[PDB]
Write a protein that binds this DNA or RNA. Structure first.
Ligand SMILES: [Mg+2]
Ligand SMILES: [Mg+2]
Ligand SMILES: [Mg+2]
Ligand SMILES: [Mg+2]
Ligand SMILES: [Mg+2]
Ligand SMILES: [Mg+2]
Ligand SMILES: [Mg+2]
Ligand SMILES: [Mg+2]
Ligand SMILES: [Mg+2]
Ligand SMILES: [Mg+2]
Ligand SMILES: [Mg+2]
Ligand SMILES: [Mg+2]
Ligand SMILES: [Mg+2]
Ligand SMILES: [Mg+2]
Ligand SMILES: [Mg+2]
Ligand SMILES: [Mg+2]
Ligand SMILES: [Mg+2]
Ligand SMILES: [Mg+2]
Ligand SMILES: [Mg+2]
Ligand SMILES: [Mg+2]
Ligand SMILES: [Mg+2]
Ligand SMILES: [Mg+2]
Ligand SMILES: [Mg+2]
Ligand SMILES: [Mg+2]
Ligand SMILES: [Mg+2]
Ligand SMILES: [Mg+2]
Ligand SMILES: [Mg+2]
Ligand SMILES: [Mg+2]
Ligand SMILES: [Mg+2]
Ligand SMILES: [Mg+2]
Ligand SMILES: [Mg+2]
Ligand SMILES: [Mg+2]
Ligand SMILES: [Mg+2]
Ligand SMILES: [Mg+2]
Ligand SMILES: [Mg+2]
Ligand SMILES: [Mg+2]
Ligand SMILES: [Mg+2]
Ligand SMILES: [Mg+2]
Ligand SMILES: [Mg+2]
Ligand SMILES: [Mg+2]
Ligand SMILES: [Mg+2]
Ligand SMILES: [Mg+2]
Ligand SMILES: [Mg+2]
Ligand SMILES: [Mg+2]
Ligand SMILES: [Mg+2]
Ligand SMILES: [Mg+2]
Ligand SMILES: [Mg+2]
Ligand SMILES: [Mg+2]
Ligand SMILES: [Mg+2]
Ligand SMILES: [Mg+2]
Ligand SMILES: [Mg+2]
Ligand SMILES: [Mg+2]
Ligand SMILES: [Mg+2]
Ligand SMILES: [Mg+2]
Ligand SMILES: [Mg+2]
Ligand SMILES: [Mg+2]
Ligand SMILES: [Mg+2]
Ligand SMILES: [Mg+2]
Ligand SMILES: [Mg+2]
Ligand SMILES: [Mg+2]
Ligand SMILES: [Mg+2]
Ligand SMILES: [Mg+2]
Ligand SMILES: [Mg+2]
Ligand SMILES: [Mg+2]
Ligand SMILES: [Mg+2]
Ligand SMILES: [Mg+2]
Ligand SMILES: [Mg+2]
Ligand SMILES: [Mg+2]
Ligand SMILES: [Mg+2]
Ligand SMILES: [Mg+2]
Ligand SMILES: [Mg+2]
Ligand SMILES: [Mg+2]
Ligand SMILES: [Mg+2]
Ligand SMILES: [Mg+2]
Ligand SMILES: [Mg+2]
Ligand SMILES: [Mg+2]
Ligand SMILES: [Mg+2]
Ligand SMILES: [Mg+2]
Ligand SMILES: [Mg+2]
Ligand SMILES: [Mg+2]
Ligand SMILES: [Mg+2]
Ligand SMILES: [Mg+2]
Ligand SMILES: [Mg+2]
Length: 63
RNA sequence: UCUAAGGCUAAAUACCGGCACGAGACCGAUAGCGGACAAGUACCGUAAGGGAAAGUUGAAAAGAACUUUGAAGAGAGAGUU
RNA sequence: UCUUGAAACACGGACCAAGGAGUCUAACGCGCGCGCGAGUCGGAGGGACGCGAAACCCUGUGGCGCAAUGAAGGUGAGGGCCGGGGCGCCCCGGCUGAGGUGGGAUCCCGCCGCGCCGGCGGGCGCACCACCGGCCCGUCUCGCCCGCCCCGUCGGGGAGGUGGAGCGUGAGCGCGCGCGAUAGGACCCGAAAGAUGGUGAACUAUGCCUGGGCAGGGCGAAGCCAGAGGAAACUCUGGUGGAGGUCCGUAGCGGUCCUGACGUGCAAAUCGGUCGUCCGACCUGGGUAUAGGGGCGAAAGACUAAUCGAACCAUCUAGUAGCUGGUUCCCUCCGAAGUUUCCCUCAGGAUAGCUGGCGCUCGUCCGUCGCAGUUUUAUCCGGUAAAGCGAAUGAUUAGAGGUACCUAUUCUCAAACUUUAAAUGGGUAAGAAGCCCGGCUCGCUGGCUUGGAGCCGGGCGUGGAAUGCGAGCACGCCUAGUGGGCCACUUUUGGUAAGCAGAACUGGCGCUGCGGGAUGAACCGAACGCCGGGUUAAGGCGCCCGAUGCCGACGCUCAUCAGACCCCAGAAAAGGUGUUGGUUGAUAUAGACAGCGCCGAAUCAACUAGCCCUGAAAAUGGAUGGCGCUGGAGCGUCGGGCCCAUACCCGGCCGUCGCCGGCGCUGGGCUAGGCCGCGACGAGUAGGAGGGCCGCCGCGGUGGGCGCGGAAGCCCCGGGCGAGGGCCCGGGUGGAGCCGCCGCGGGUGCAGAUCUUGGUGGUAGUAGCAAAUAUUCAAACGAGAACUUUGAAGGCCGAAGUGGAGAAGGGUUCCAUGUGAACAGCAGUUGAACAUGGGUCAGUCGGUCCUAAGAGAUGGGCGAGCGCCGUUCGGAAGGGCGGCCGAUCGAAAGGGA
RNA sequence: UCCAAGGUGAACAGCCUCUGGCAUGUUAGAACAAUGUAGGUAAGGGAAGUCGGCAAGUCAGAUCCGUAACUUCGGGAUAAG
RNA sequence: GAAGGCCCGAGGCGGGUGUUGACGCGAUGUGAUUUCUGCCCAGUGCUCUGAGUCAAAGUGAAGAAAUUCAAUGAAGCGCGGGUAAACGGCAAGGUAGCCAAAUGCCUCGUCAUCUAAUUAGUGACGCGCAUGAAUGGAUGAACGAGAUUCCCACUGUCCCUACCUACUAUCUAGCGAAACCACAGCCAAGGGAACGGGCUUGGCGGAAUCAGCGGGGAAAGAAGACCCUGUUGAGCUUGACUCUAGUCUGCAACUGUGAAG
RNA sequence: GAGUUUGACUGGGGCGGUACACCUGUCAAACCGUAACGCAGGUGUCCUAAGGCGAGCUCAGGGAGGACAGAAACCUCCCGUGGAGCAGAAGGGCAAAAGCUCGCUUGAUCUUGAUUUUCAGUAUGAAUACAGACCGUGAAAGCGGGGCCUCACGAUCCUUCUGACUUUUUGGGUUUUAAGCAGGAGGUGUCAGAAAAGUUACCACAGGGAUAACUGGCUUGUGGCGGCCAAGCGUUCAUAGCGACGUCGCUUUUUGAUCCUUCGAUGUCGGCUCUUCCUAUCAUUGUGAAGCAGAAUUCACCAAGCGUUGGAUUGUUCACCCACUAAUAGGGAACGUGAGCUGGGUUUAGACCGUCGUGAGACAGGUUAGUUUUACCCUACUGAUGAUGUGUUGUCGCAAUAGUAAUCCUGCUCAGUACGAGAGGAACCGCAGGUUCAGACAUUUGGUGUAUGUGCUUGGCUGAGGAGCCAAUGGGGCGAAGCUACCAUCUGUGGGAUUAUGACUGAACGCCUCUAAGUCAGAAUCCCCCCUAAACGUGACGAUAAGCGCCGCGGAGCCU
């Protein structure tokens, strides 16, 4: 009472039945798996980014 | 915190059996109880047990006198409604 | 119906009627509707007071939410702006109450083009999403501050990672509807089994008790008698006797062979002939004993009531079933899978995929986002085909040269070889998430703004390839079915091969009809609402059979097995001086070829290619589909015309779907859940969803409904309506109830289930009414005589009877009269039928009495207990000085006046 | 289970009859085909049939004779003829 | 040898054998007589001895105790002996016998006999696939509804059928079922689920029926007993898993009195 | 004694194998992926270094050399792209490396999260890149948290160990104990992980044509059969008859392969019986060829009309043998044929023996005994009524079509002839019979015989005789009629076109030629006659009832 072992015959039709969908490209992709030492300093760059907010307003006025 | 190795004690509670009632968005004679009827009857098995089928003339029997064919069932008229 | 495949020589279905299969309760999830809403619900109970067991009111105990997290001790969720100060990296004050980036329906404003309408310029940005902070709990690393009456092994906080079903201005709760997965009998029907309790030894197996029965003959044992022989011991002969798991054989009991008869029988084991045994381990009745995992067995798993390799009965029990079978109205729309992973899985599930439903977030003139089974451009990837081995590895042929090697060549190869190397194919990119200019943050990086990344401001569309197209929400949420596939081109593995087995890719079949191939699940064409006209595809156009009934074109071919077109349904090697082409050569008018120098013009050889032919043998008679066709109806090359598919074009109608559709501004109109307009579209199994003014039963409403002037039901060569489910009307029949509309509750729709119950067919006036010799004549009664009765004749049983009486069993069958309806398988004047009466007389026949094997109380013992064990074993004498030793039951064949 | 006539014969065998009983066994008439079931015969050959002398047939009573191999001395034995 | 063997039994001062007592009862094997009954005690099993493992209870030790440790340490196992008319084999290597057998694969063995002809039969031969001695070997009169070979006799078994009789069938009067049945019923070929009756192309096809018949309907009769599957069973068996009645053994209790070592 | 278990995959199942958890090369068709009990292999380990780092060094092999010393000992030089080695299978990688050697070592340590691969994108296993510690090494840059890379491994529960702490040990406190958190290990190889021996023929149930045994279907390896080529055989001569080395086919009477149909069942081996079919012809008919003188035989052609037998053994098909014969050819039809038979084999349950298993049991080893059911239904076939439309009815005929039938041999004669040296030894016509078959038939012979015909006779009965009866036909002798037997007897048949083949004329092709056009002979084959049947076919002819037939275009009308 043997049967069939492996088949990929009708699988291409099933895959394209709803179409092969790529993940929607999102701005600001996820930062998972990045260097932890790099992520530490990048958090500190955003943590103290408001410290130079007064210099930003002064330099924008020169333009 | 209680005082075992002694006892008693109603109510609220349970009830498919029985007795007597009320009811139904239930079943309507192959349904509802097996059983609407001489149903746990007929019938079967040595026995323990198994277990049916089967309700309806019309309002009122007024259920067809009488005549005639046939031995008779069974018919033809007549008659009741 | 299962299936890859069914008209199947696969299964179910003779026929009709009624019944007949997805339910209900609990709990869960999602969607939807309703109420209230950081709440929400009385679902216990209490109180008002026919239908009222309702409804009304109160009660928030409690449940579920509002807080999470850790194993636990436990602890436990506020962001931002402004100013000052500290300059590390986090103090103070104030104003507020969830931040920042990108996107964002809607709203707001400016300007322009026309207080309306379009351009691009900004803003507040919902929900949601991507990302980055922040906070709470667990845990880890690095740590230097702080708090106190219970200063300690005390309790607090920081910084940076990380775990969590968190917080980040709640969304739940109650109720109802639907679907999905469950547990319950669980869609219906079905096991082989298992368990508890009980009933059977009238069959049979065996022991016991008490009875009964078993012709006629054969051989003829021990004992005995007599006569003989012998010197004796002892022997011999005749007769007698009547022994035995002896022989022939009847009854009886068995059951060999015919593998006979029968085999829907006389019979759920019989009949005939034949056969075994028939004084014995013989046969048999009755009374007793042993009871189901037990009994009993001269042993066959035999037998234990037609049941035995574990009886029967009822219950547990609607036992379970990954396995078969069946699973009931119509329509509209969408529409599969036999594949992935895991599984004591491989007839099955879980999971992913494919499916459907429900939506939701947006877009919806150009424009811009966004999208793609496709090209283009740019740039990468690979090691297959082919090639190579005078290159590596491996294999391999032949010579040559120099001195078996060695050099230079040469032949042939690789799938597990390769220097090379495609075609097809895979990945990425083709901008605003960009470019450009100027700054800011950092604790990372460091010779040095040096990097890097993040952030801020400003400026710049020619959107920065072609084409098509609406997208997004981890392609959201729930989700059925499927998880046996099969076939074809190409590629490809095993196999001699296979209508074989196993893969890749795409299409197809399955799920699919249609035209064509005669025919046929897959091939060719083309996919499907209902029609009209037209035109085609593939394929055809002698006739069957629509179309060449053209003065079609050119050749090829004769077949005493001609040939006749994808898949495709019989041919090969090798041959032909059949015929027709072509190729390469060779002789010849200084005269060849062939034939006897004559002859006088071409000839010969090899090879190749078409058609035909040989090669070519199978069994029922037969297959270009058939007829038949040979100036073609054959083969090849083509032309014009013609034939028709559910395909294409145009038109009508129906439905679905889509319109940033239209209409509240009324002769008609607007049941807005309506009406109207436009465009496209239409296959379907399993499956899903919606609609039904389809149908059935019952309820609350409602129609001042219907009905003896005729309801329901039923019948109809009556009239109709609807695409259909169905419905209305008319007639006939019927005789008392019935129906429409809005809601509500289901035991709601049948052709199947070797369905259930009931009824009826063909078979069919058929099988049959055939075991045991046999009836006939006359008469009588009578409507009626092959069957009754009487008489006569002829026969049978032939005293181990077809005779005369009992036992067990039957229970009025006995007897008389009467009936002829049903029964007595023909008939019947007859009956063991039916109806009405009658009939069984005991001291001395049996029961009754006795105990036989047995059974069974008392004492006693056991046992949870109903009870069981036990038949002497205890103060056991109810009589007339007593012995008894075991009450009682147990024989209609024992005992017994 | 009980009673059990005559003839034939060794016989309660088979066959015939008497006493007694019965009407041919849940039907009849006609016909006499095949094929059956049951019964019987068959010339000549005699198991050539067939898995196989299956079935059938031969033999049979009694009387007078005659009776081996073998043997457990009993038998074989109704040997056989 | 009865305080027993064997067995029943839920249970007792229970019950059977047993109204018994070794010439008995119980459990097995072989299977009259005659004739023999060989070898192996390793394995398994039974049985018989007194020198590692060994439960509970009891004793000792440590510890606050629970607990732990130690010593002691039954039966059984292990060790040892016997046993094969125990299972078995031939630790022993098949002895006496027997045979191509009811036992021989090769095989229709070889030889003789039996017939014209013999895979049969018989007598022999035996390195016997795979005979063999109470898992009994060999023989054997009588006996056998046992298997087998031949001969005589006999016969319709046959060559080779025929005829006769009885009851049926058949016909009639009366009476009157059942299995079965999707629809049904003439074929060839083709295709097809690869053996059509129906479809395709042909052959062709004429009411209603009787008696026969056994080709067909892959005829009927029965949800194949063969084969496989099922995480379906049952009967039986063991060196299967897990238990158990029974039985053996140990401890304290019922269990008292006294002496001695 | 009770309960339960006794894996799965699988070209049925079992046995075998593990394709059951993994790895390499290939298959695999140039991304990845991709199956089979596809191919060639590996794995349940090994390593305190064979881990880590640094430094130096260069291998396999070859040439030339150098006491013993040689084809291989060691020393030296030169060449040497790795042709060595790197623990193992294979692939890849690797040269002042990853190899070899040496000296310092324990990054094979303590942690958080992310990622890759198998993937459902779960787990495990094994990997990748960081980060925070603590270290090793090197002068340092760096490198290292196992092995150069691709394999070398394991959930819950439970036990055990280590570590940590405001962790619990339940009204508090202390100490034991127990529990918990976190990280290891003890293992499930059926490797995402039950706790597991059989037997069943005494078997049971659910099913399955998803799946075996029997037919058919595809295939033809094998079997059978037949070509082609021509080495050679045939004294010589390849092809009279043969055919090596090769090679191309056919057949479905072998077997195998496959598993498509059937497991709510297609009765299954042989024989018997019986019909038809095939030819790959054994015999007969007509021919061609020879290593054909005759005879016998061999090869080949047209050809299946006709025939292919009787027996011993065996269940057997198949073989073997005895004879006979013209020959004793080969097969199909569901391996034709079981509601046709027969049960011998096989193929339930009983039983024996051998081998096997401890056992129950098994054995395609042997042996013995073992129920063979139903037709009356539909077609088919066999016969029997009848139906058909021309008025009824009858006689006498025609005839489509269908069936079809004869066959083989012997003796005599030719003829001791032809032929041959002989030995031997035919043929045509003719003649006499026979075999098998067919259709008849009973005069004769045989058989049956219930004319129950006539005798004989047994038992019984009728009083006896006489005459008879009964015994399922009492028995027996003979026997009419009838029926019946190669067991008696009779009869069995003519042509036509042609096949094979041999020829004529005669081209193609000045010749030749059976052929191309045209002609001839020509057969057991074929067709037909003869013969049997007689159609929804029919001709001639007779007789045809107050009814009825002809004749008045009867003369007018009604239905179809
Ligand atoms: Mg599968
Ligand atoms: Mg597999
Ligand atoms: Mg009550
Ligand atoms: Mg009722
Ligand atoms: Mg078929
Ligand atoms: Mg079925
Ligand atoms: Mg049926
Ligand atoms: Mg109904
Ligand atoms: Mg925003
Ligand atoms: Mg059980
Ligand atoms: Mg005798
Ligand atoms: Mg007798
Ligand atoms: Mg009998
Ligand atoms: Mg019989
Ligand atoms: Mg019969
Ligand atoms: Mg006898
Ligand atoms: Mg008795
Ligand atoms: Mg019981
Ligand atoms: Mg048995
Ligand atoms: Mg549709
Ligand atoms: Mg699919
Ligand atoms: Mg199935
Ligand atoms: Mg699904
Ligand atoms: Mg699933
Ligand atoms: Mg399936
Ligand atoms: Mg395939
Ligand atoms: Mg297959
Ligand atoms: Mg399907
Ligand atoms: Mg489709
Ligand atoms: Mg075709
Ligand atoms: Mg049209
Ligand atoms: Mg056509
Ligand atoms: Mg040739
Ligand atoms: Mg040809
Ligand atoms: Mg249109
Ligand atoms: Mg109802
Ligand atoms: Mg219902
Ligand atoms: Mg119905
Ligand atoms: Mg009476
Ligand atoms: Mg009376
Ligand atoms: Mg009657
Ligand atoms: Mg009565
Ligand atoms: Mg008494
Ligand atoms: Mg008495
Ligand atoms: Mg009679
Ligand atoms: Mg004779
Ligand atoms: Mg014979
Ligand atoms: Mg006999
Ligand atoms: Mg004798
Ligand atoms: Mg013994
Ligand atoms: Mg021993
Ligand atoms: Mg010997
Ligand atoms: Mg013989
Ligand atoms: Mg012998
Ligand atoms: Mg011995
Ligand atoms: Mg006997
Ligand atoms: Mg059919
Ligand atoms: Mg059948
Ligand atoms: Mg079945
Ligand atoms: Mg399974
Ligand atoms: Mg059983
Ligand atoms: Mg079991
Ligand atoms: Mg299996
Ligand atoms: Mg690849
Ligand atoms: Mg580190
Ligand atoms: Mg199949
Ligand atoms: Mg071959
Ligand atoms: Mg050859
Ligand atoms: Mg031929
Ligand atoms: Mg014979
Ligand atoms: Mg056959
Ligand atoms: Mg048949
Ligand atoms: Mg049969
Ligand atoms: Mg047969
Ligand atoms: Mg047999
Ligand atoms: Mg048997
Ligand atoms: Mg001469
Ligand atoms: Mg007399
Ligand atoms: Mg008599
Ligand atoms: Mg007689
Ligand atoms: Mg005579
Ligand atoms: Mg000719
Ligand atoms: Mg001629």
């Amino acid at each position: 009472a043997k049967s069939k072992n492996h088949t990929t015959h009708n699988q291409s039709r099933k895959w394209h039945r709803n179409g092969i969908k790529k993940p929607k490209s999102q701005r600001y992709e996820s930062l998972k798996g990045v260097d932890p030492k790099f992520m530490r300093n990048m958090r500190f760059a955003k943590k103290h980014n408001k410290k130079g907010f007064k210099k930003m307003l002064a330099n924008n006025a020169k333009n």
